[PDB]
Design a protein around this ligand. Structure first.
Ligand SMILES: N[C@@H](CCC(=O)N[C@@H](CS)C(=O)NCC(=O)O)C(=O)O
Ligand SMILES: N[C@@H](CCC(=O)N[C@@H](CS)C(=O)NCC(=O)O)C(=O)O
Ligand SMILES: N[C@@H](CCC(=O)N[C@@H](CS)C(=O)NCC(=O)O)C(=O)O
Ligand SMILES: N[C@@H](CCC(=O)N[C@@H](CS)C(=O)NCC(=O)O)C(=O)O
Lengths: 240, 240
């Protein structure tokens, strides 16, 4: 490398031993099409940023490998390495909500550019990250995944009540608004609607929460799922 | 107001009907000394930013009032109004992790100033907001608050296992590091250590998680609780 640049080398990141980069000039996404993974693929599809997706398979415990954990020591998807990071260096990152803020800043898309609006966006991303995701996820556990040994439905009922409470927050926020921040679709929507979708789809919790009681949520969710970039992001990484 | 500035008027914010501002030139904090509330009071005490604390009492359901909910429609503490906000206007904000990022940016303290470091800080705040807080909180419910009607200890055991897993992430991260981001104490520490403290103190879950198995965590926690600004922040708002 005396006279010119090498092709992008990501070998400093041990995760690349397990999922080699065919396109090391592109952001590398290590994910699975779950509500948290699709936040990031949807963001990438919306913004048009090139990326190389890699399927992290739970059936083979891929997320528990040293290779995966070298990128995310929390053992969870999604995670990224952007080869074209700040200060001209690769940037590893995990936590879906952090990735959304990073990506919005990188190219100045899908976050308000005024300061107050930016902090409001971060607030609603935090609401999702600390409320929607954790609590809808616990309902999914107790309704869908928990076996017959959990005979007591009190934990389920706790998370039904909390999920309804959170849906009510969203419902009131969306009154008179197209999207969570008003007219402009943003990372707050990308963080939140995949979880509403999962709750009432995959988790089969739509009857428990009575989704029809939240007409603004139903409006915005229907709009969200129909966006072509959302449809693309929901199917990435490809399972086959 | 023809010839000069009025004293700061926060009357546009209905929360001020319930907790009037004696010092409307200061950031207004609506909180209670819980792990999430003290993140913000600790940050304020660390940075030296003036603030006026207001005790939001759960015994009188203050957080469920229209006045409180006009600021945080999610009905939770902490929440703030900074009268001296971006663009010279007051800034309302909720979600502890969002407030921490706002405050660090406002005065350029306790977040790295280089881009990569900033995103790493946001990542670890997200780890706390989506992992530590929600999961330690569910353990607190099932261990401390849940009554005898929850005879099945399977939910408790689920959150014990998850809390131990999260403590292990923190433990490995702190190996060879003073604080979560290395040498420099930051908002990542402020977000996280109040929750470790609460888990092993108020929640009485220290035996369940065997805190002594996490010597780096014990080191950093002991350092954290001894900081004079932490001691001040843990006692704000004052209950009497
Ligand atoms: N707070 C994290 C949560 C990520 C998360 O829950 N990831 C799940 C899939 S949706 C995962 O990787 N689970 C694997 C496991 O727990 O072993 C984020 O938003 O990124
Ligand atoms: N270890 C997890 C495995 C399942 C999992 O990771 N679920 C994700 C969704 S794909 C979750 O609930 N994440 C919570 C969040 O996003 O905060 C569990 O036992 O629930
Ligand atoms: N994700 C929120 C969580 C805040 C939270 O859980 N607040 C609790 C106290 S620590 C609360 O106000 N609970 C009142 C209630 O649920 O009614 C944040 O970090 O600010
Ligand atoms: N409505 C809550 C009341 C208690 C509460 O708000 N707890 C807070 C701690 S003070 C919590 O667990 N917050 C979770 C987080 O921070 O994510 C519950 O039923 O657990």
């Amino acid at each position: 490398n005396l006279y010119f640049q090498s092709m992008t080398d990501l070998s400093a990141f041990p995760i690349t031993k397990k999922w080699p980069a065919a396109h090391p000039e592109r952001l590398q996404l290590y994910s699975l099409p779950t509500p948290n993974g699709v936040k990031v693929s949807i963001m990438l599809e919306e913004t048009g940023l090139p990326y190389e997706p890699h399927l992290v398979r739970f059936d083979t415990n891929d997320q528990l490998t040293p290779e995966f954990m070298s990128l995310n020591p929390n053992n969870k998807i999604p995670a990224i390495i952007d080869p074209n990071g700040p200060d001209g260096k690769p940037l590893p990152l995990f936590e879906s909500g952090a990735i959304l803020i990073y990506l919005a800043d990188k190219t100045g898309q899908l976050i308000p550019q005024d300061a107050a609006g930016r902090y409001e966006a971060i607030q609603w991303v935090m609401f999702q990250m600390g409320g929607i995701g954790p609590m809808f996820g616990q309902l999914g556990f107790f309704h869908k995944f928990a076996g017959k040994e959990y005979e007591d439905k009190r934990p389920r009922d706790r998370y039904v009540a909390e999920s309804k409470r959170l849906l009510g927050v969203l419902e009131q926020r969306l009154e008179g608004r197209e999207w969570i921040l008003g007219d402009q679709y943003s990372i707050a929507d990308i963080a939140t609607f995949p979880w509403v979708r999962n709750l009432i789809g995959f988790y089969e919790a739509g009857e428990l929460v009575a989704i029809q009681d939240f007409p603004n949520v139903q409006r915005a969710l229907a709009a969200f799922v129909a966006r072509p970039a959302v449809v693309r992001g929901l199917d990435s990484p490809k399972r086959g």
